[PDB]
């Protein structure tokens, strides 16, 4: 028999109850703007599918960020545009301002409202205990929002979190790998960066959901509270699961494989071995102990589960005791 089917525990049917047009991004008609409204100021960085620039809107002298959509299928372009339009105005989600094409090269570009080019990876190994809780809560607002809107990000990692630490403001960026969640859909498992890939991607379980983002978030949290970058440091996608298995243990891994009737790639048979589930205390030392609390470990434990169904949802995560002081201070402000 094949793999056992899976459904998201939350927001399962939200796209089914929308109009077709909400999620049928292949049918979306983009009104392409004029590239000449903007002047590029400077390169901010060059990614995999994108070059990103600081630019000026020469109509209002407003600073913007421009992402030139490096050669890729039109299908992927429409998907990213439609997701950005659907999520526009959501909490801590980057704001799409315009969509333009080069009159010559015909190359699409996305224009975003300005954010400083300071990503979370530059700051997240130097935060106080309170600021880790604060910024994790801000990321959870973006994830509960996009999940509630029927969208999984699929590339949650520190390089995709822009922070203005001065203004205590955060935006979740790079929606290029994001997808709409549809119950029973089998997704590409070649998404996310190696260190943030959930076990579902590593064992090739395709019927995954929003809970993939919650694994990635757990990898970020573990990195920050233990000052260990990355937390799960695999050589390649096979060794990545071994690094996880040495922490979470093999018993829960094989129970997860049995539960979903997953056919494990033969390469895994000699490399996973047999490992106890490690107590989180093993990762605590004199230079991280100020970031580690019972509350932090209880929360982390509930994100980092093999079984995607077991993991906290974004809204359940926001209700965890780890965030009580953040929630109280927000209500006061
Ligand atoms: Br938006 C934008 C503005 C000017 C540009 N020059 N090359 N590519 C561009 C994209
Ligand atoms: Br603003 C901004 C900066 C970089 C980005 N990469 N993808 N989306 C982005 C938005
Ligand atoms: Cl990163
Ligand atoms: Cl490791
Ligand atoms: Cl132990
Ligand atoms: Na401590």
Query: Which whole-number Å values give the CA distances from 207 to 2, 76, 304, in the listed order?
Result: 12, 20, 18
Alpha helices (H) in 150-293, listed in sequence order? 199-202, 211-226, 237-248, 250-259
Tell me how far apart the alpha carbons of residues 312 and 180 are, in angstroms, rounded to a whole number: 20
| Closest of 288, 303, 186 to residue 248, by C-alpha | 303
Phi and psi based region of residue 174 (left: phi greater than 0; alpha: psi -120 to 50; beta: remaining) = left
Does ligand 1 have an atom closer than 6 angstroms to the CB of 38? yes
Q: Cα of 159 to ligand 3 centre, how many Å?
A: 4
Give residues with Cβ within 8 angstroms of 84, minimum separation 6.
Answer: 94, 96, 110, 175
Tokens representing 174 are 């790079």
Does ligand 2 have an atom closer than 6 angstroms to the CB of 67? yes
Burial class (CB within 10 angstroms; exposed 0-12, middle 13-18, buried 19+) of 172: buried
CB-CB contact of 127 with 79 (8 Å): no
CB-CB contact of 162 with 173 (8 Å): yes
104: number of Cβ within 10 Å: 7
Resolution in angstroms comes to: 1.7
Pairing of strands 33-34, 96-101: parallel
Buried b / exposed e over 78-91, threshold 16 CB at 10 Å, is bbbbbbbebbeebb
Tell me how far apart the alpha carbons of residues 78 and 28 are, in angstroms, rounded to a whole number: 7
Solving technique for this entry? Answer: X-ray
- Locate the DSSP E strands across 84-241: 96-101, 108-113, 151-152, 161-164, 169-172, 179-180
State whether residue 130 is helix, strand or coil.
Answer: helix
Tell me how far apart the alpha carbons of residues 5 and 209 are, in angstroms, rounded to a whole number: 12
CB-CB contact of 95 with 88 (8 Å): yes
Buried b / exposed e over 133-156, threshold 16 CB at 10 Å, is bbbbbbbbbbbbbbbebbbbbbbb
State whether residue 71 is helix, strand or coil.
Answer: coil
Positive or negative CA dihedral for 25, 149, 120, 40? Answer: positive
Tokens representing 122 are 């530059």
Give the DSSP H/E element, type plus range, for residue 86.
helix 74-87
Closest C-alpha to ligand 1, atom 1: 35
Q: Cα of 284 to ligand 5 centre, how many Å?
A: 12
Among the bound ligands, name the one nearest to the CA of residue 46: 2
Pairing of strands 50-57, 62-69: antiparallel
Spot the catalytic one: 155, 174, 209, 213: 155
Tell me how far apart the alpha carbons of residues 328 and 323 are, in angstroms, rounded to a whole number: 9
Q: How wide is the angle at C-alpha 324 spanned by C-alphas 227 and 321, nearest 5°?
A: 70
Residue 111 CA: nearest ligand 1 atom is 1
Q: After which residues is the chain broken (C to N over 2.5 A)?
A: none
Burial class (CB within 10 angstroms; exposed 0-12, middle 13-18, buried 19+) of 213: buried
- One DSSP character per residue, 180-196 reads E--TTPPPPS--S-GGG
Does ligand 1 have an atom closer than 6 angstroms to the CB of 99? no
Give the DSSP H/E element, type plus range, for residue 332.
helix 324-332
Phi and psi based region of residue 271 (left: phi greater than 0; alpha: psi -120 to 50; beta: remaining) = alpha
Does ligand 2 have an atom closer than 6 angstroms to the CB of 153? no
Q: Catalytic residue at 24?
A: no
State whether residue 96 is helix, strand or coil.
Answer: strand
Q: Cα of 252 to ligand 5 centre, how many Å?
A: 15
């Amino acid at each position: 028999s094949g793999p056992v089917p899976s459904r998201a525990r939350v927001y399962t049917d939200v796209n089914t109850h929308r109009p077709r047009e909400y999620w049928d991004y292949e049918s979306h008609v983009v009104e392409w703007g004029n590239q000449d409204d903007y002047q590029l100021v400077r390169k901010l960085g060059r990614g995999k599918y994108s070059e990103v620039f600081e630019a000026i809107n020469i109509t209002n002298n407003e600073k913007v960020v421009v992402k030139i959509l490096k050669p890729v299928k039109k299908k992927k372009i429409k998907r990213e545009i439609k997701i950005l339009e659907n999520l526009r105005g959501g909490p801590n989600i980057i704001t799409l301002a315009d969509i333009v094409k080069d009159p010559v090269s015909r190359t699409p570009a996305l224009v975003f409202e300005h954010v400083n080019n300071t990503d979370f990876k530059q700051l997240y190994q130097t935060l106080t205990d309170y600021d880790i809780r604060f910024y994790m809560y801000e990321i959870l607002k973006a994830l509960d929002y996009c999940h509630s809107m029927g969208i999984m990000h699929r590339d949650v990692k520190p390089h995709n979190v822009m922070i203005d630490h001065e203004h205590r403001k955060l935006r979740l960026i790079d929606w290029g790998l994001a997808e709409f969640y549809h119950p029973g859909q089998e997704y590409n498992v070649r998404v996310a960066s190696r260190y943030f890939k959930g076990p579902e991607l590593l064992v090739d379980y395709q019927m995954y959901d929003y809970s993939l983002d919650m694994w990635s978030l757990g990898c970020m949290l573990a990195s920050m509270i233990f000052r260990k970058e990355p937390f799960f440091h695999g050589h390649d996608n096979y060794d990545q699961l071994v690094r996880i298995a040495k922490v979470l243990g093999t018993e829960d891994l094989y129970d997860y494989i049995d539960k979903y009737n997953i056919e494990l790639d033969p390469r895994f048979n000699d490399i996973l071995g047999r490992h106890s589930r490690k107590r989180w205390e093993r990762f605590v030392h004199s230079e991280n102990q100020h970031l580690v609390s019972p509350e932090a470990l209880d929360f982390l434990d509930k994100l980092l589960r093999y079984d995607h169904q077991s993991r906290l949802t974004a809204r359940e995560a926001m209700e965890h005791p780890y965030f009580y002081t953040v929630v109280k201070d927000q209500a006061r402000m």
